[PDB]
Amino acid sequence: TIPHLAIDPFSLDFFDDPYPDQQTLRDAGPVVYLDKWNVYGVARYAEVHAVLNDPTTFCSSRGVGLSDFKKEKPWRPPSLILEADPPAHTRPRAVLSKVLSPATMKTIRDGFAAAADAKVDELLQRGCIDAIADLAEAYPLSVFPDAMGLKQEGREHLLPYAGLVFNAFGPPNELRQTAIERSAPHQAYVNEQCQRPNLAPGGFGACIHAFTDTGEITPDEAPLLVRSLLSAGLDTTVNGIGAAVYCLARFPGELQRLRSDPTLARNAFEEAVRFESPVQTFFRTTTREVELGGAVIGEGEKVLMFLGSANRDPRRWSDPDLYDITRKTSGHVGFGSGVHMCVGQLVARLEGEVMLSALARKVAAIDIDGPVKRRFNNTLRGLESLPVKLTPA
Ligand code: HEM
Ligand SMILES: O=C(O)c1ccc2ccccc2c1
Ligand SMILES: O=C(O)c1ccc2ccccc2c1
Ligand SMILES: [Cl-]
């Protein structure tokens, strides 16, 4: 009576065509057993939300990828923020929270909006640009590392580093294994930029470091908390911004609606996060016997959370399959929900806003003239190439 399923939600065929299979996983019960990996999973908005909002029953401190840390050697020592539970999680959540506050945002928005306008300009003069490498990658890349206060050298490694991390959450398939064995130079690069002297003052890196001086964090914890933003900080957004553009490309009218009202910018990004959901999936582990979606699940059980699914659940969302920029997007789980809810959402939104804001004032049409190509990854959903023509306003 927990229906089994052959669906492998970490398979290349699944990533290419997720959406029919997701539907199955919601209409198969509110709780399902994937025979493939021996793990329970919940796909509906209903359950997903509940799970995220009960950290006590569904802890994160035993891994939020497949591998239970209670039993297995992590591939690296875990997050202080992501793979920790209240009480422990509160301190580093705090320190990160301050660092990335709407205060901190105000002091940097202008820079971000400026570069956002110049990049849409730069591209418009080409015409045929690749919406990923020339925009979704390029724009985040230009701004975010600088905003961290990183060196120039080495930024090659950022996306491959974050991809590794995001791959390591999945099951021990090909994507994952490969990613690990190619990993060393990426890490060695990141571990280097987390150290105090390599972070220019002003940047999130140094702002984070100051917390060592007050006692707020230790100096061992200091670099670990930076690593944290260099894992979760870029790929996600690259992928979000890319996702957005993909939308306005497939929904011409909805673009006209944005051009017409460019103050809907921020919200157009958000609905895009709902609509594609960059971070697709994430595990928890039970800490007691818990009754979930009608079923009783024993403790120390892994539960997979289908975050994308939740965001497209017909049961919670009117017309889940449509990119509608005016939606009440509040409630979507694209940045998670509850205590771990993306501590960086603001930066992401700042980015997505100004970018889409610029696109709005400056561009007239977006057409996909090319072969569109998909970057596969156990946890991240996004594109590798998206060839577009860009009509100038
Ligand atoms: C638009 C792209 C982004 C998406 C879709 C996204 C998604 C998420 C999600 C779903 C979670 C919850 C994890 C969980 O519940 O276990 C989360 C947490 C987190 N995010 Fe993001 N994020 C994005 C951008 C960012 C940025 C720009 C930063 C850095 C400033 C960031 C840093 C973090 C960190 C450090 C956590 C752990 C939070 C905690 O445990 O309290 N993310 N993010
Ligand atoms: O997301 C990426 O851009 C990316 C690129 C190369 C990657 C190589 C190995 C593992 C993950 C990777 C992710
Ligand atoms: O603290 C980290 O290293 C870390 C790593 C990967 C992460 C992935 C998504 C969100 C937060 C993350 C934090
Ligand atoms: Cl690492």
Side-chain angles (χ1 to χ4, degrees):
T1 79
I2 303 182
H4 294 83
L5 281 156
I7 290 173
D8 187 339
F10 293 115
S11 71
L12 295 174
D13 293 330
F14 176 88
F15 294 124
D16 264 311
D17 192 18
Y19 290 123
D21 258 339
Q22 291 214 1
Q23 188 133 28
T24 315
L25 298 170
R26 269 162 315 196
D27 308 334
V31 172
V32 303
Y33 180 97
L34 315 169
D35 289 345
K36 179 62 173 171
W37 295 111
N38 296 132
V39 173
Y40 298 107
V42 311
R44 299 181 196 177
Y45 180 97
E47 278 58 51
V48 158
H49 190 262
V51 194
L52 295 160
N53 288 277
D54 193 9
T56 299
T57 306
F58 304 100
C59 76
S60 277
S61 73
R62 291 182 58 169
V64 292
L66 184 55
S67 174
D68 195 306
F69 292 174
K70 193 191 192 169
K71 313 158 199 145
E72 305 153 68
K73 186 188 183 144
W75 68 285
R76 57 170 195 174
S79 274
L80 270 44
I81 188 153
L82 179 59
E83 315 200 273
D85 289 320
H89 153 102
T90 306
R91 178 155 72 89
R93 165 85 185 200
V95 176
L96 280 191
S97 186
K98 296 213 40 54
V99 159
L100 300 167
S101 67
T104 305
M105 296 308 100
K106 176 135 213 162
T107 84
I108 52 141
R109 159 185 271 277
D110 279 354
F112 281 57
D117 283 43
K119 204 77 192 188
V120 188
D121 281 348
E122 200 250 320
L123 317 179
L124 266 170
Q125 223 175 31
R126 277 186 237 158
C128 196
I129 53 109
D130 174 302
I132 310 297
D134 278 311
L135 174 40
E137 256 161 47
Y139 172 59
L141 177 63
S142 75
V143 285
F144 177 41
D146 283 357
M148 289 287 316
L150 252 38
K151 267 147 183 184
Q152 279 282 171
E153 31 261 290
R155 302 179 183 205
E156 299 91 52
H157 285 264
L158 287 176
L159 275 66
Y161 175 79
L164 177 63
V165 178
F166 280 110
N167 265 320
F169 292 128
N173 61 17
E174 193 277 318
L175 282 146
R176 182 171 183 261
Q177 202 204 302
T178 288
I180 273 148
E181 63 212 20
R182 295 219 199 97
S183 99
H186 296 313
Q187 319 190 84
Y189 160 81
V190 163
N191 297 307
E192 184 49 27
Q193 305 315 120
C194 298
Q195 296 336 114
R196 206 166 178 168
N198 307 150
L199 296 154
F204 308 148
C207 188
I208 275 163
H209 262 276
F211 282 85
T212 42
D213 294 344
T214 68
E216 272 172 290
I217 63 172
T218 82
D220 273 49
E221 287 163 355
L224 295 52
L225 262 158
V226 190
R227 202 188 64 152
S228 209
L229 315 189
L230 293 182
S231 306
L234 188 27
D235 276 32
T236 53
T237 46
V238 172
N239 260 9
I241 300 200
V245 175
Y246 181 72
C247 288
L248 303 157
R250 199 138 160 99
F251 293 94
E254 287 280 346
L255 171 54
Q256 310 317 142
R257 292 184 59 190
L258 161 60
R259 300 183 43 198
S260 191
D261 192 16
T263 87
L264 297 192
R266 200 152 170 123
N267 212 247
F269 173 48
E270 203 103 5
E271 153 76 347
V273 182
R274 180 202 60 91
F275 187 68
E276 272 290 276
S277 301
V279 189
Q280 281 279 108
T281 48
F282 250 144
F283 291 79
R284 291 294 196 270
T285 313
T286 66
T287 49
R288 69 165 158 90
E289 153 170 336
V290 54
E291 201 264 354
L292 178 68
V296 173
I297 321 297
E299 99 171 74
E301 277 299 308
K302 280 273 172 171
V303 180
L304 180 44
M305 289 183 314
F306 292 100
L307 275 305
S309 183
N311 277 350
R312 285 200 174 215
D313 188 4
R315 300 165 184 76
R316 158 82 182 72
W317 307 98
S318 288
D319 297 327
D321 281 23
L322 306 213
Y323 181 65
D324 165 76
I325 72 165
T326 49
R327 201 178 303 239
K328 257 157 220 219
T329 46
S330 295
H332 83 82
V333 285
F335 298 86
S337 174
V339 288
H340 290 277
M341 203 200 192
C342 183
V343 72
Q345 61 187 293
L346 289 182
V347 170
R349 279 192 215 114
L350 175 47
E351 293 187 19
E353 194 190 318
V354 302
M355 181 46 51
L356 293 219
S357 184
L359 275 183
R361 284 162 289 170
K362 280 173 191 285
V363 173
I366 292 176
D367 318 286
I368 297 157
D369 182 335
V372 175
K373 183 178 179 180
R374 182 158 281 292
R375 219 178 291 149
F376 300 135
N377 183 287
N378 281 326
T379 289
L380 295 197
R381 209 226 159 18
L383 280 187
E384 194 196 339
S385 64
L386 171 68
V388 292
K389 197 140 292 284
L390 283 209
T391 295

